[PDB]
Amino acid sequence: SGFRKMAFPSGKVEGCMVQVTCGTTTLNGLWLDDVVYCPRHVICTSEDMLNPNYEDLLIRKSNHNFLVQAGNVQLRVIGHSMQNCVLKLKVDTANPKTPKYKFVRIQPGQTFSVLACYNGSPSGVYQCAMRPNFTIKGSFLNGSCGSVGFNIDYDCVSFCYMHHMELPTGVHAGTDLEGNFYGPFVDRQTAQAAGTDTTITVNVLAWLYAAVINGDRWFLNRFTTTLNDFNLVAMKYNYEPLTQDHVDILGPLSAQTGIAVLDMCASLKELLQNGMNGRTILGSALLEDEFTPFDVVRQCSGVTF
Amino acid sequence: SGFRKMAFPSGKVEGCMVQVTCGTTTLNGLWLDDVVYCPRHVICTSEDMLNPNYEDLLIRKSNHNFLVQAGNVQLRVIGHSMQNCVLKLKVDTANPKTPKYKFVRIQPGQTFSVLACYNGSPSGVYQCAMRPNFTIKGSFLNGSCGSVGFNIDYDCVSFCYMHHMELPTGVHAGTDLEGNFYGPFVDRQTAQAAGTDTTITVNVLAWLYAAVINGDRWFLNRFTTTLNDFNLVAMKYNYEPLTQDHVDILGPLSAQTGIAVLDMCASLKELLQNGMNGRTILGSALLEDEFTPFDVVRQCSGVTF
Numbered sequence A, B: 001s002g003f004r005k006m007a008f009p010s011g012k013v014e015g016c017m018v019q020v021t022c023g024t025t026t027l028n029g030l031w032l033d034d035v036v037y038c039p040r041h042v043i044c045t046s047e048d049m050l051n052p053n054y055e056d057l058l059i060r061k062s063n064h065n066f067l068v069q070a071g072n073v074q075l076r077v078i079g080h081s082m083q084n085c086v087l088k089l090k091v092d093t094a095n096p097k098t099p100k101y102k103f104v105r106i107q108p109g110q111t112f113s114v115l116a117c118y119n120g121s122p123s124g125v126y127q128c129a130m131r132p133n134f135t136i137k138g139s140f141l142n143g144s145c146g147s148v149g150f151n152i153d154y155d156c157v158s159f160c161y162m163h164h165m166e167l168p169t170g171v172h173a174g175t176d177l178e179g180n181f182y183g184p185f186v187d188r189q190t191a192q193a194a195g196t197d198t199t200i201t202v203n204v205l206a207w208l209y210a211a212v213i214n215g216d217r218w219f220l221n222r223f224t225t226t227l228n229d230f231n232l233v234a235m236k237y238n239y240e241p242l243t244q245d246h247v248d249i250l251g252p253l254s255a256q257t258g259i260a261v262l263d264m265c266a267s268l269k270e271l272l273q274n275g276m277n278g279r280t281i282l283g284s285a286l287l288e289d290e291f292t293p294f295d296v297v298r299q300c301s302g303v304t305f
């Protein structure tokens, strides 16, 4: 029993982190086989940052200008190229700790673990959701760019995120490992808007099923609703619309608890318009939306990797 | 910017986990040098669990009754002994992945990371505090016993917790790595009380300093207080008394923000008796007490390992 925000074990990803330095700028790189991936803004000086011309900046760079360190060992850079917003540095040595891996572009609402690093060294791990507005609520300081987000499926690491920047609202933005930003963001020092930060409705419902499974049932009411009725109410509170696919994704948790999905929707509806009246659910006084239905099933089932 | 509950990178501990089986009972063991540590209740059957006589149970066991598996490899058990509530299995092979380590008995209020495991395989990592009543709020299912809690200092792993049991209130109890329980608990299937679950006051204040540092300042008020005045109010809300040592531990965060510790106490006092009026602090609608002052400093400073 109990329910916690839980990250994947980070060992397979720790062995892929290196330090990448151009001039005075140092950030993190991901070393997989014989390539190191890192944010392209490693090549900016503080003065290029308002509106950098990355093509013109990169053209002044040679292989030997990139210093790549794995521990106290320098990797020899034998080629470099830009792919969208990431730099790929070809090195003469394949990482002996490369895990089985693939690159994935995740969907809004899906979760992943972040290994926050500085100077190529891990600082900690935490779990994030890709928000509907394609930001994440992370913890990142100067020097954290190139830290990556990932999921693990048994023995295979799915890399889905590399960190690039902070928005004025204090949330975070970055790219997939092909260097394409999530959302409408660009890698320059300008104020950029993410737009309305809507709540991942299917995830809140999964978390409410987790609550029932772990003994918190006070919020279950005597009503049901319809998908259209529920969505008319939830969108007034900036909740994402619930689709029939979402209803079926919740099916196994519904079956496991004996609470119909639309009954849970009616309980969520009442929570939204009446609040929690000073009470808590799984130790929270807000509705939590960063657990997926698969996260809930895995945690309540003890899936291992 | 941003502030998250963050676990230590788990790679050094992942390489120490093994599976330990007696009869039909399988749990996790920690393999360090040539010893495997695990909860002694691996030797119980479901029928011994109400009031087990561990001395009499262990006496019927021989080395070859313990099956220890690291991956698909069996470790040869060449000796066994009971130390308080943990079993120590001597094996004929030293773990080649043993990190630098030590065993530590932590203090109430201190935090650590848990690597939750099943069948010797990691399932995830999360951060916990040792509560004042010597429980933890974890996420543990059948088969999770032997999962460990730890801190990392640069390159040294400090093991502080091994998981044994759940209480009726849904919180969790376990031992240090010398097998001595935290708190008044015993490893049998009886209803056991942990007593009043009081709030770690110094940690709430650290988290409020984290909030100021990360831009949430709405709760700062125009008052100050005294240590005695503050403690008279906080203990009515089941908060731990704040000592002058605690005040000095908060000193660097106070210096970094320019908010005197007793001014922050007066802001906490008003939060306790007036609530948060529907507002949030660092994304929470409750006062969070599972960040230590050192946790806050490390995270706001980017300390790496």
Ligand SMILES: *C(=N)[C@H](C[C@@H]1CCNC1=O)NC(=O)[C@H](CC(C)C)NC(=O)c1ccc(-c2ccc3c(cnn3C)c2)cc1
Binding pocket: A027, A041, A044, A049, A140, A141, A142, A143, A144, A145, A146, A163, A164, A165, A166, A167, A168, A172, A186, A187, A188, A189, A190, A191, A192, B001
């Ligand atoms: C990578 N190492 C950092 C990670 C940042 C540092 C602080 N927290 C993080 O997550 N990445 C950078 O420093 C980025 C580099 C550029 C080239 C992409 N830049 C930013 O993250 C960044 C920060 C702040 C602003 C900003 C511009 C204008 C603003 C405000 C607020 N008001 N205005 C008018 C913020 C832009 C870019």
Ligand SMILES: *C(=N)[C@H](C[C@@H]1CCNC1=O)NC(=O)[C@H](CC(C)C)NC(=O)c1ccc(-c2ccc3c(cnn3C)c2)cc1
Binding pocket: A001, B027, B041, B044, B049, B140, B141, B142, B143, B144, B145, B146, B163, B164, B165, B166, B167, B168, B172, B186, B187, B188, B189, B190, B191, B192
């Ligand atoms: C280790 N693999 C498990 C971990 C437990 C399983 C569920 N969640 C956990 O953290 N450890 C055990 O199963 C323990 C084995 C004994 C020998 C220590 N036992 C328990 O964890 C346990 C669970 C429940 C109770 C209990 C007894 C009496 C009760 C209640 C509630 N009301 N009453 C009257 C609970 C005792 C021990």
